[PDB]
């Protein structure tokens, strides 16, 4: 931990970037998180919603 002030910068940047990528798995209320999977089954007038 003597070098903790330098290790924490690496850990915080890696953790922030990892959370940013993991947010792509969330639905936010949509029927599916995969944009191509929803677009391939629902019609444009509702797929836009």
């Amino acid at each position: 931990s003597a070098l903790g002030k330098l290790q924490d910068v690496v850990n915080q940047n890696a953790q922030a970037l990892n959370t940013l990528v993991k947010q792509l798995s969330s639905n936010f209320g949509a029927i599916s998180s995969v944009l191509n999977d929803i677009l391939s089954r629902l019609d444009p007038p509702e797929a836009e919603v």
Binding site: D43, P44, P45, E46
Partner: protein, 46 residues
């Protein structure tokens, strides 16, 4: 745009509808701005 249709599927004249008329005969765009007017013409066409 004036044409003759039959009550069965006549509802298909609308944005984002599917069916023989909407897919093969007359298709409105998704952002259509206007009015659709219809009336029964049995006394004239039948």
């Amino acid at each position: 745009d004036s044409f003759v249709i039959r009550g069965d599927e006549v509802r298909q004249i609308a944005p984002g509808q599917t069916g023989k008329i909407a897919d093969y005969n007359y298709k409105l765009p998704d952002d259509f701005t206007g009015c659709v007017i219809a009336w029964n013409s049995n006394n004239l066409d039948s």
